[PDB]
Amino acid sequence: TSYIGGEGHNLQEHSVILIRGGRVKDLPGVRYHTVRGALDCSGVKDRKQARSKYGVKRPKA
Amino acid sequence: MKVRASVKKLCRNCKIVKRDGVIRVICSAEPKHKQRQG
């Protein structure tokens, strides 16, 4: 199981995803996480900070 | 070729004939009126 911690979602019931490490301590059972910016899962639009996470693609200038 | 037990005209070109004893009805408007026995 995973967690898509963040304020967007796109994925679908039958998309392919990626997995990284990260625990929760709110969810007994989760010990992984999503990778947004990567493959067929879109990042959250206009979250300027922590942009190395979540793949916002540097809001222009 | 309806083998119905009663023939009655449905077009106006229908005629009732006497061929070989068997009563029949033809029509040349819609040749779907052709029947027997009636």
Place this chain on the structure above:
Amino acid sequence: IARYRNIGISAHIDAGKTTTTERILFYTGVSAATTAFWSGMAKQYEPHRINIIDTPGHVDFTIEVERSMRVLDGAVMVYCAVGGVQPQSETVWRQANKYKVPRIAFVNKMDRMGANFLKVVNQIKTRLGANPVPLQLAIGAEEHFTGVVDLVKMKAINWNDADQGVTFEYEDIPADMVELANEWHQNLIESAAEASEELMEKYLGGEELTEAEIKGALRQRVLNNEIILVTCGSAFKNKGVQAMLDAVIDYLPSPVDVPAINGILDDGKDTPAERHASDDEPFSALAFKIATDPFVGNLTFFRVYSGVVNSGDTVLNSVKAARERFGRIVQMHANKREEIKEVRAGDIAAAIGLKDVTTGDTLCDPDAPIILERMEFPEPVISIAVEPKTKADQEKMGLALGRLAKEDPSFRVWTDEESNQTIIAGMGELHLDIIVDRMKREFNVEANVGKPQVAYRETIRQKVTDVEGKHAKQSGGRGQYGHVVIDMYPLEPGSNPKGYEFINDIKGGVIPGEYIPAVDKGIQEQLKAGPLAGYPVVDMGIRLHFGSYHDVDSSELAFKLAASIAFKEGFKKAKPVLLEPIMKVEVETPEENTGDVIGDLSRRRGMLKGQESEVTGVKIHAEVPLSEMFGYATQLRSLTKGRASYTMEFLKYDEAPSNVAQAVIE
């Protein structure tokens, strides 16, 4: 640059196309980018490199033709002598005039019984609205055809054919047929003087024209799209094949003889700049095909228009903003992958192993601004879902359709966030199943296909007022006491922005105010989960009059629980009914289809909503429910000579009958 020849043999199904191509390949010696060579009298018999763009067979999937049209500079329009011009023959004509690319017409099946050349010519002029020019003419009838008379050079060639139709003999026109065939000899001198009035002086002066001048007349009109050329032919009994290419080398343009593209830019003062026909200009190309070879790799085709490339440079492909690199360039002789490192301006190549090359990317080798081309605009007509026999074999064909939505721009996919299976989309019956077959044999996923489900909304109708819900679950130390008397509406359809409304209607101090928004959010949880069919509900504006509460039993989870127990009865007491999603369809059935199509539409429970008559188009608009819409365009092309299509848009809902309520089943 003057020598190259980018040709496209596009044709209706069963016309002769595949069999024609083999007679090109077998002659020129002595996939999608097959190369050739020939030597032509029009350009003093220097060698001329034909680069045959393989045109798609199923021209129904119009997108692949549209890419093909641009990359070809010339086109042979193969036709059928017995059947005249065809439905898809008029279809490929539409794509060709769109990109202005001129053609030559090819009357195949001359050997076949019932062959008249004049049939096609009449059919050319009548339906397609062209001014055809007869180049050569059959000596004799269907079986008796042996002779080809090039009336431009006023010579003749026969065939006893003696070794596969290659060796030939010189004749003149025999006495029995001079006079009636010289009517179209008279047609040649009059249709060749409006481009330059110097040839007008020879007709009203009495100077009979020689061989090379009339080519100077006729070629420019097949450079500026005024008249087309019609040559005779027969591939299957190989009579007329030598002069067939000598129709192409005398009339059709070359990469220098085509107008350079007036393509748009993306920088500065947004002015149109050229991509000239000079061989030493800053390079730009356009990738059109992606094929995975058996054992050569991921072939990344593209057309070499203008400039020099020394292979092994970086590319500034500014439609995706990524810099890729080259493996090779490949050109096939028969399908013979004989290698080359030289990228000549006017050739076509097939590069290898480029990762993220889609279909329709305008790439630039010396990192210049592109001549930007955006051309992926046919739209698929069918929404049919799939069912692969394993979900691990589903995302592999979801990778293969993820490849097929990356190789061919209108065979896209639909990711369904809502219903567990995806949609394959096409413009025709056959192009859907050939990719089902290609993923059956090559990509190896067999499919027991299934039809999709429908969006299925609801609405209520009765004016119920009272309905309440109590929940006195005390039972212990700390419990839950809620009471929220609700009321609803058979709400107005499309005046409000959202399909449900809510308003505070408290009489006194009978409820705490903080729970009152939370009641609306609880109904917002409990709207879209309907107890009728498991399908989401819309169209009621719920108001709330009476209430109650407690000191110790004041969990707000109670003030969202019993609001559904008030809406368990409240759903149950206003006699609801499902809403069917109604489409808004329009279809242009030209003239001899109207009785069929409207009869087709009325059987699909649609209503007559008027029509117009633009110059040929009798276009009928209607509204149609989505219940039985599995395969409309296949039902439409069957009764319309496969000409018409449809493009719709979902707009509204309406009262469903009980048989759609008989589709509730669960």
Place this chain on the structure above:
Amino acid sequence: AKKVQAYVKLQVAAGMANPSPPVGPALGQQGVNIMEFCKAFNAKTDSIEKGLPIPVVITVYADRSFTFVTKTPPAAVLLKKAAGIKSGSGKPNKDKVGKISRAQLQEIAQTKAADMTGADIEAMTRSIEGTARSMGLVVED
């Protein structure tokens, strides 16, 4: 009088140019393309008055001749402007749906007496009386 060479018996809705919404595809399916018609139609419709209905007696044929005959408005839609009630019902005998005095029918069909030729004046208005009484807008002399 012709029957079919380029003939239609329609196009009475003259509230707006380019008559494609009320009549539309019958004009475009029967030869008479609108590109030279409406360019010539406001050379003959602006000559009299606007806001009227018009029966087009189109004496046209295949070799691009728009020779034009016009008439007084038809008795179905003459009374739309002549009565001033905008009520054309379908129950004539069941209920009184409007009022005309017959002298009002005289002056609006003294134009029909000048335009159309039935026999003579009171008989030509007598031909219109049953057409008027087929709607519900009854006439009271």
Place this chain on the structure above:
RNA sequence: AGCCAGGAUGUUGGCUUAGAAGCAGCCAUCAUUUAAAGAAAGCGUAAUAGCUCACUGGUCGAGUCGGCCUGCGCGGAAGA
């Protein structure tokens, strides 16, 4: 009853005008001349056209046409 010739419709008559333009269905079911002719009996048109009926106008040139009641048969009516 047939052969030659019209079908004597102004008018697209409302509605619901999106097509219901004699022929979807509901209302009216008028008047041109009323020698034949209803704003309509039918096939047939997405909608017209078109094919024809009503009426035999002229010709032909004698009976002919639709029912009521009965005598007698026909079809209805296939088994090892």
